């Protein structure tokens, strides 16, 4: 199925050094089986969570998630260095996966 | 010295003996599991550093996944066992190869045999890592060929 | 850690009689020795006073060769000095140091002897 | 990949040092300088060999931060595991610690006496603190450390004229190493206690 | 660590097959789950359908089906067959595995290089 | 029982330790507190957690009581032992003693005062006793333990206020355990230097 | 006997180098007697908390009129004794057991293999306890089965 | 060789199989080196005297040939590879010998059983010296009757 | 060597520990009072054990053995270790150095308080000493008793009252034994982790 | 250690057998390399040969040859017998070996015994 | 089969405690399979210095020798007692086994 997610809407910009709070709505009760990716201008996309909270290999302790049960959430410690990107949340418990639309982390004027 | 930790003897895989690690614990590796007969030569003490290793990722499951949160660092249990878990000579013997040049063990890429059409994985040796990354794998051949003949040499037990 | 402070010095006019204490830790008193050393202002750290686990020899050095006691005691975990009859050679910041590398030398303490 | 006797197959696998940061410290080191021990997930160390110094009184008071308590009090261990471990140290003059103020700092004055550049006599404050650090941080110790050698590993000379700790929160550490736990147990293992490991150890 | 370059025919108009060509190095070509996943601008991420071994190749069920997606296990280099390309398939293709054997991870991912369809 | 592969049946033994009675102390627990250790057989120690004070505080005398070597002062070596092997003891006034009067009384500070640190921090004069408590009392010490297995090793804080020592003699103690000299071998273990020189054969 | 109590054989059935408990020292109970294999092992591994309960057991024996026979409770003795009897690693480690609630034994109880053929005995492991009493012989079987084909392997030597 | 310091380089001129010495490291005899099972030995022991000198020994010809000694005897270099190369407690374990008590070991020299008909050899124990010169060859007979036996025991591995 | 069991013959080796040379010092005794720690082929140590003494000051300068630039190291780094092994040692009286000139030299006064091990604690610069500096001499140990009772033995003393280590570069001495580290080895195993002043 | 003793004819007549006897005390006989060395007034020494085992028993090649040096298995003892004998022969004999095992050292020398040529 | 044995002809005394030269040149093709032999008045020689130039069992260490292809030095460091005694030099890398004319180690008066 198509298994649709609508995430932060357009747009979750966030000043250096600050908080964010990346989510990822599932519609049917996929329970734990979801990932996070993330991908720059340039380079190809990178995962950064799997799982549901589990770290990713050379990936730092900022990055973290919580689970709601449909309400996913990724949370970020404190932005550092170039880490403003755009990411992705997958899930993979039916067979057709399907990725997220894709929300931008613009940079705070 | 000596009279340390034997192992947890977990039930992951279907079995009561034997022990294994998660994918989140290995890098850049899927979730990988021994057998229990391949594990029994750490459950014997030695000085390889492998089995060290296990009994350094034993304690923590068990002083994390069925303990209680005393979350100030929890430093102060580590120097009850600090004999007790890694193996004190092998370590320092180890130090001793990192400044002569020798291929030294820092406890990372592990190398081991693995029989595809039975799961009779040897226990791993330590890939020992010079100042130019690790060896290229032929620097040592000879090495993993015993571990291969003594393979066979313990094929006659099992048969 | 718990490095071994000392506090019972002070100025004082001479021919006082003024004790001095020095406490540890790291549960190593009762085997590892100890050393006292006075640094007067001018030149490095010299030999004071030395004892080694229970009381066994326990002089000076010959620049003193007995102005005071020194005498441990296993439980309560403390040495004290009781000094008499100061002179102003003996003006320097001391220090309360053990043998093993268990621990530290005190953070100082400074005896000034003058009648004025 | 490649076959060996054809019967059996080589296979790889890496341990990740990170789950062990609940029970036990953790060592990494970034580029030439500047290793850590990262204990948990929330506080860290700092070990940087530079040639500047952060340091300006000659004084190290340690008794009277602890009764305050200005400190986590995880970290200080590991500079008390650190500082005895040190061989034949046996002057403090050189030492210097600023606990006060929360904020956990010491610093070792290096062979100023020209004692580590003009020539390496090693029996001053030149290679206790070395040869701590290098067991303290396995992070490839020899160039991050400026190792050298086998040339008397006794006296082991350097150009950086001061040690400076700090209490550094997060900037994306462990560069050029994974961290290791192998670094700090060795120095602790090594301590324990070292009074009798008698008896029929083998 | 795996490294994976992959290239295409960026030279495609309208209704011919398509046929990447990911290039495997330093690793076997059994016991992995290679997949094929695309970027197309205006719309977000389809998982086209992974091929392990020689045998399960399953292709996106129900959304296009038909992919006929090979290995070729001779030179670690498989490669695709698209059928039917229409104006919205213009997108950038990769190739990409997981931890050596699984589903869920994705890890080792390729360069990426861009479709268009031109005529 | 159930008989092993046939041929072998398995039996089980439990050991007496009162053999060891006029050799070595033997250290139980009655039900939930009372901690005992006896020797000479007419005679033992009463370590005893309640809240209540019983000694008059400070001026703890010891060198008064150097006038007897044995008989009501073998089971003093014991106190030492306890004493001595106590991690991270700073403070004198942290402990008081009654031994005029002809009987042992020691009481000690269980930080009675908690605000000093305002919460179980480390560093309080009577952070080791309670570490070094189960040790001497092993007996399944489940006494100062707040269910599970692992709870708080280091730097426990009980709701206890005081430890004291007396010379209790005979009411038919050690109910909920066995006698065991284990633990007092282990902390005697740790804080003396001895030699076994061949005897018998090798 | 380097560091060991060397344990002085009692003659018990005849002279097959074992020692012999009597009744007033295990609790309901009665005479029983070791020999060759039993003490001669406690020599190699000292993992045994038998063979060092025996030291104990052995050397208060002897104590009483032997190396010296006061009445004053003998504290001064093995107080420059106490590691040739017991290996105080060994006794710390069952308190590492003990915290972290993996089943330790308390040097009460102990368990062994005895078949009726030839009536030779095993030497007796500790039985871990953990607060729920002992164990009910159900969740370390599998060591007795080792011990039961230790036995069998120990059989070839004696054929 | 013994799986010690610099990897495959613990032979004398080619033995692949073991650690092959020379005459000028032996006194009074000519190219006697082992190899095979004899030499693997040390690992599983670890703990006896000649393991303990054959590693002094490597630690030698391997700290010659590199670390570049510019005639400074190199006294630094063992100032903290005592415990990685012999068995500090070994030592110590001897101390508790040689004061007034049975004949002791200083590691001069060392016997062990040869085969003269295909080329087996078992690993050495060093021959036990007292105030009186070496021993007579039969105050230790039944020691060397276990190892000789002990050498059918490993044949029937082989077979 | 003798013919056991038939099928397995004896045999005997011995190691000739004369290469361990520039890598660790080697002990030796020649006879009843000399000890030598051959370091290299070029310099070495003795220790002369004899009724007369040869320090005529009641000054040891330690820091001068470093401070001066003195006799090539290589002799140092084993005259520390010895010291410092010492158990229970807080007798600094007796002991008194040379090291003025190049030519160093460390004596000790044993037991000069009456000698006789006192009554029951041992513990006079007397235990202390000969047990640790025995160990050097590891090969051989039989001079006396010790009245050691049912626990440690650590009384073992003579009736020799200096202890030298002179700068000899010697004869080719070492006639009743051969060169081993053994002696030097368990020296540097024990208590040599802390240099306060010792 | 390996003790030696020789004792030999000591009176000689010009032309006749010659015989010595080398003792060998303690030691086995076989795999050792026994040899016969003499020292002669006004020249150097001369290896006159070796006996090992049974079969190879190199006589001094080209220099004499004729020696017929034998080695007797009953009693550890092995002899020697010259003939033709010079005046030049008048010299001091020894019997030596190896470490046990080999060609090149004479390490454990005798003490050996002077014969002279007389009439 | 004669390997010529010129051994520093007549004579190389030197004085007490000082340096020796001893010398012995090869004229055929020996290599580095030349021993040492040193005998005293009486009794018989013993090896001093075996293969080329290292020590043999026992010896003192000033005992050293020097390898040049085809000129063999004997080398005394710091001579002591009565080392004055006669030497020679042997050849075995052939099997004539030959022995040389050897050199006698005269005393300073
Ligand atoms: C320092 O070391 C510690 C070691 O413990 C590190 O923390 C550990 O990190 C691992 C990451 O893999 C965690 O494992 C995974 O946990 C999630 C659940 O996550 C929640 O619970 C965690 C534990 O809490 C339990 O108990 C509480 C009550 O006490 C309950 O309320 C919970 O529900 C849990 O039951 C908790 O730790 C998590 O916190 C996360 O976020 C914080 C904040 O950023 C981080 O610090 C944490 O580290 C952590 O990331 C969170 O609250 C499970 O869902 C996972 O399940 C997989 O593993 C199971 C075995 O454990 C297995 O049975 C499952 O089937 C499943 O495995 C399968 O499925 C997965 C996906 O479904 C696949 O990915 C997998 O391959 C397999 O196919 C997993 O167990 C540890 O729980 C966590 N431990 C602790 C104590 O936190 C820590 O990160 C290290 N820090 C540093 C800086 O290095
Ligand atoms: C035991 O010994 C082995 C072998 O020495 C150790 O293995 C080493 O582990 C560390 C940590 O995992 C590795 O360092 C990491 O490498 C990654 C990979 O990046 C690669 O590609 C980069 C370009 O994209 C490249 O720049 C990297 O470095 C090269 O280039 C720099 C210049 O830029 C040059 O200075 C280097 O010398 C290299 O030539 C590298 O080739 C790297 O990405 C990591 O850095 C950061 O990565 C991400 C980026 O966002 C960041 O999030 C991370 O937090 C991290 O900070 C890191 O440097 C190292 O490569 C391994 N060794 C080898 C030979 O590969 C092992 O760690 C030892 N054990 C233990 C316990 O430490
Ligand atoms: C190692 O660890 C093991 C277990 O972990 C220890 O084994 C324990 O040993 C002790 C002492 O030997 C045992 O206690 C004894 O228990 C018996 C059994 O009696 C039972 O039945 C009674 C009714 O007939 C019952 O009353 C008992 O107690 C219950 O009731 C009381 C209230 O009265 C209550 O407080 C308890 O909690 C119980 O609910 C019990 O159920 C008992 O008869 C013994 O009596 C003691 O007291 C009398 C008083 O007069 C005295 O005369 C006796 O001589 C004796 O002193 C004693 O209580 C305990 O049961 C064992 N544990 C298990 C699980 O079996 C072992 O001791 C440890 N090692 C060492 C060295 O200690
Ligand atoms: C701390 O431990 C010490 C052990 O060191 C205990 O002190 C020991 O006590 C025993 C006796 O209690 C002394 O030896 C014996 O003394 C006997 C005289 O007393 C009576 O003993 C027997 C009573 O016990 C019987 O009944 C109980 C049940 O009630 C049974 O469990 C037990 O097995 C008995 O069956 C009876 O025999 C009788 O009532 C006696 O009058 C002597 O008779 C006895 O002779 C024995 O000698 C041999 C060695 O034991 C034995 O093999 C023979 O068969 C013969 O029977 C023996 O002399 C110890 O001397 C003494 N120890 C020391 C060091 O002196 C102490 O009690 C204990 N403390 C506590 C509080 O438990
Ligand atoms: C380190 O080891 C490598 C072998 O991989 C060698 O080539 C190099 O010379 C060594 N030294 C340095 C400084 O890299
Ligand atoms: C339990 O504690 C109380 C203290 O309130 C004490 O009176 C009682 O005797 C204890 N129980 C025992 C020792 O069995
Ligand atoms: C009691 O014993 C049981 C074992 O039966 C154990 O699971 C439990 O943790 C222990 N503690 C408590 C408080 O039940
Ligand atoms: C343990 O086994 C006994 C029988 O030996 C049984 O009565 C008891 O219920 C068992 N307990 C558990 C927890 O299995
Ligand atoms: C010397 O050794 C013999 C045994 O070889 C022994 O009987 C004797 O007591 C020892 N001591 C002396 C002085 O002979
Ligand atoms: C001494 O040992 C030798 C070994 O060769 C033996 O022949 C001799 O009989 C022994 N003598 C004594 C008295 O033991």
Same mark, same amino acid.
């Given at each position: 199925?198509?298994?649709?997610?609508?995430?932060?809407?357009?747009?979750?910009?966030?000043?250096?050094?600050?908080?964010?709070?990346?989510?990822?709505?599932?519609?049917?009760?996929?329970?734990?089986?979801?990932?996070?990716?993330?991908?720059?201008?340039?380079?190809?996309?990178?995962?950064?969570?799997?799982?549901?909270?589990?770290?990713?290999?050379?990936?730092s302790?900022?990055?973290?998630?919580?689970?709601?049960?449909?309400?996913?959430?990724?949370?970020?410690?404190r932005?550092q260095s170039?880490?403003?990107?755009?990411?992705?949340?997958?899930?993979?418990?039916?067979?057709?996966?399907?990725?997220?639309?894709?929300?931008?982390?613009?940079?705070?004027? | 010295?000596?009279?340390?930790?034997?192992?947890?003897?977990?039930?992951?895989?279907?079995?009561?003996?034997?022990?294994?690690?998660?994918?989140?614990?290995?890098?850049?590796?899927?979730?990988?599991?021994?057998?229990?007969?391949?594990?029994?030569?750490?459950?014997?003490?030695?000085?390889?550093?492998?089995?060290?290793?296990?009994?350094?990722?034993?304690?923590?499951?068990?002083?994390?996944?069925?303990?209680?949160?005393?979350?100030?660092?929890?430093?102060?249990?580590?120097?009850?066992?600090?004999?007790?878990?890694?193996?004190?000579?092998?370590?320092?013997?180890?130090?001793?190869?990192?400044?002569?040049?020798?291929?030294?063990?820092?406890?990372?890429?592990?190398?081991?045999?693995?029989?595809?059409?039975?799961?009779?994985?040897?226990?791993?040796?330590?890939?020992?890592?010079?100042?130019?990354?690790?060896?290229?794998?032929?620097?040592?051949?000879?090495?993993?060929?015993?571990?291969?003949?003594?393979?066979?040499?313990?094929?006659?037990?099992?048969? | 850690?718990?490095?071994?402070?000392?506090?019972?010095?002070?100025?004082?006019?001479?021919?006082?009689?003024?004790?001095?204490?020095?406490?540890?830790?790291?549960?190593?008193?009762?085997?590892?020795?100890?050393?006292?050393?006075?640094?007067?202002?001018?030149?490095?750290?010299?030999?004071?006073?030395?004892?080694?686990?229970?009381?066994?020899?326990?002089?000076?050095?010959?620049?003193?060769?007995?102005?005071?006691?020194?005498?441990?005691?296993?439980?309560?975990?403390?040495?004290?000095?009781?000094?008499?009859?100061?002179?102003?050679?003996?003006?320097?910041?001391?220090?309360?140091?053990?043998?093993?590398?268990?621990?530290?030398?005190?953070?100082?303490?400074?005896?000034?002897?003058?009648?004025? | 990949?490649?076959?060996?006797?054809?019967?059996?197959?080589?296979?790889?696998?890496?341990?990740?040092?990170?789950?062990?940061?609940?029970? +036990?410290?953790?060592?990494?080191?970034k580029?030439?300088?500047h290793?850590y021990?990262?204990?948990?997930?929330?506080?860290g160390?700092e070990?940087?060999?530079?040639?500047?110094?952060?340091?300006?009184?000659?004084?190290?008071?340690?008794? =009277?931060?602890?009764?305050?308590?200005?400190?986590?009090?995880?970290? +200080? %261990?590991?500079?008390?595991?650190?500082?005895? %471990?040190?061989?034949?140290?046996?002057?403090?003059?050189?030492?210097?610690?600023?606990?006060?103020?929360?904020?956990?700092?010491?610093?070792?004055?290096? %062979?100023?006496?020209?004692?580590? =550049?003009?020539?390496?006599?090693?029996?001053?404050?030149?290679?206790?603190?070395?040869?701590?650090? +290098?067991?303290?941080?396995?992070?490839?110790?020899?160039?991050?450390?400026?190792?050298?050698?086998?040339?008397?590993?006794?006296?082991? +000379?350097?150009?950086?004229?001061?040690?400076? @700790?700090?209490?550094t929160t997060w900037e994306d550490h462990?560069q050029?190493?994974?961290?290791?736990? @192998?670094?700090?147990?060795?120095?602790?293992?090594?301590?324990?206690?070292?009074?009798?490991?008698?008896?029929?150890?083998? | 660590?795996?490294?994976?370059?992959?290239?295409?025919?960026?030279?495609?108009?309208?209704?011919?097959?398509?046929?990447?060509?990911?290039?495997?190095?330093?690793?076997?070509?059994?016991?992995?789950?290679?997949?094929? *996943?695309?970027?197309?601008?205006?719309?977000?991420?389809?998982? *086209?359908?992974? *091929?392990?071994?020689?045998?399960?190749?399953?292709?996106?069920?129900?959304?296009?089906?038909?992919?006929?997606?090979?290995?070729?296990?001779?030179?670690?280099?498989?490669?695709?067959?698209?059928?039917?390309?229409?104006?919205?398939?213009?997108?950038?293709?990769?190739?990409?595995?997981?931890?050596?054997?699984?589903?869920?991870?994705?890890?080792?991912?390729?360069?990426?290089?861009?479709?268009?369809?031109?005529?």
């Amino acid at each position: 199925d198509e298994i649709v997610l609508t995430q932060s809407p357009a747009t979750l910009s966030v000043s250096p050094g600050g908080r964010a709070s990346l989510s990822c709505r599932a519609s049917q009760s996929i329970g734990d089986k979801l990932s996070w990716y993330q991908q720059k201008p340039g380079q190809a996309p990178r995962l950064v969570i799997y799982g549901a909270y589990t770290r990713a290999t050379d990936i730092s302790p900022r990055f973290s998630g919580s689970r709601s049960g449909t309400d996913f959430n990724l949370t970020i410690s404190r932005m550092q260095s170039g880490d403003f990107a755009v990411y992705f949340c997958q899930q993979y418990e039916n067979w057709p996966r399907t990725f997220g639309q894709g929300t931008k982390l613009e940079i705070k004027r | 010295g000596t009279f340390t930790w034997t192992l947890s003897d977990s039930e992951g895989k279907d079995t009561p003996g034997g022990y294994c690690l998660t994918r989140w614990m290995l890098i850049e590796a899927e979730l990988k599991c021994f057998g229990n007969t391949a594990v029994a030569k750490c459950n014997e003490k030695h000085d390889e550093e492998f089995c060290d290793m296990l009994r350094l990722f034993d304690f923590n499951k068990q002083a994390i996944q069925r303990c209680k949160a005393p979350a100030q660092m929890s430093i102060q249990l580590i120097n009850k066992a600090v004999n007790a878990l890694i193996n004190d000579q092998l370590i320092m013997k180890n130090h001793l190869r990192d400044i002569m040049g020798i291929p030294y063990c820092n406890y990372s890429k592990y190398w081991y045999l693995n029989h595809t059409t039975t799961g009779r994985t040897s226990l791993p040796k330590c890939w020992l890592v010079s100042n130019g990354s690790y060896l290229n794998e032929t620097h040592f051949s000879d090495d993993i060929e015993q571990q291969a003949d003594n393979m066979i040499t313990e094929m006659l037990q099992k048969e | 850690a718990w490095q071994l402070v000392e506090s019972g010095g002070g100025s004082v006019q001479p021919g006082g009689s003024l004790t001095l204490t020095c406490q540890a830790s790291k549960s190593t008193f009762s085997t590892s020795g100890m050393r006292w050393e006075r640094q007067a202002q001018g030149k490095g750290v010299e030999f004071v006073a030395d004892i080694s686990s229970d009381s066994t020899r326990k002089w000076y050095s010959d620049s003193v060769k007995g102005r005071f006691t020194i005498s441990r005691s296993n439980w309560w975990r403390t040495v004290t000095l009781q000094m008499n009859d100061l002179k102003p050679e003996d003006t320097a910041r001391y220090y309360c140091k053990d043998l093993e590398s268990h621990h530290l030398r005190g953070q100082g303490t400074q005896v000034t002897v003058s009648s004025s | 990949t490649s076959l060996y006797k054809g019967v059996y197959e080589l296979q790889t696998l890496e341990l990740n040092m990170e789950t062990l940061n609940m029970t +036990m410290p953790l060592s990494c080191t970034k580029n030439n300088s500047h290793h850590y021990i990262m204990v948990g997930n929330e506080t860290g160390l700092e070990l940087t060999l530079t040639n500047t110094s952060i340091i300006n009184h000659k004084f190290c008071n340690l008794s =009277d931060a602890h009764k305050k308590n200005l400190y986590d009090h995880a970290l +200080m %261990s590991i500079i008390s595991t650190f500082h005895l %471990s040190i061989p034949n140290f046996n002057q403090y003059e050189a030492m210097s610690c600023d606990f006060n103020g929360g904020k956990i700092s010491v610093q070792y004055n290096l %062979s100023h006496s020209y004692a580590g =550049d003009a020539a390496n006599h090693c029996g001053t404050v030149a290679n206790g603190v070395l040869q701590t650090f +290098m067991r303290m941080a396995w992070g490839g110790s020899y160039i991050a450390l400026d190792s050298g050698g086998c040339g008397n590993w006794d006296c082991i +000379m350097t150009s950086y004229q001061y040690l400076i @700790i700090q209490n550094t929160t997060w900037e994306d550490h462990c560069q050029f190493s994974r961290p290791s736990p @192998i670094g700090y147990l060795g120095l602790l293992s090594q301590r324990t206690r070292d009074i009798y490991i008698s008896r029929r150890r083998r | 660590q795996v490294q994976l370059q992959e290239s295409g025919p960026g030279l495609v108009k309208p209704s011919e097959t398509l046929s990447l060509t990911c290039s495997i190095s330093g690793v076997s070509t059994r016991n992995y789950y290679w997949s094929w *996943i695309r970027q197309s601008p205006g719309k977000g991420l389809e998982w *086209i359908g992974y *091929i392990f071994n020689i045998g399960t190749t399953n292709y996106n069920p129900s959304l296009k089906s038909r992919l006929t997606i090979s290995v070729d296990t001779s030179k670690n280099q498989f490669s695709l067959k698209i059928t039917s390309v229409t104006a919205a398939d213009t997108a950038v293709y990769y190739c990409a595995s997981g931890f050596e054997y699984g589903d869920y991870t994705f890890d080792y991912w390729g360069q990426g290089t861009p479709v268009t369809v031109s005529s």
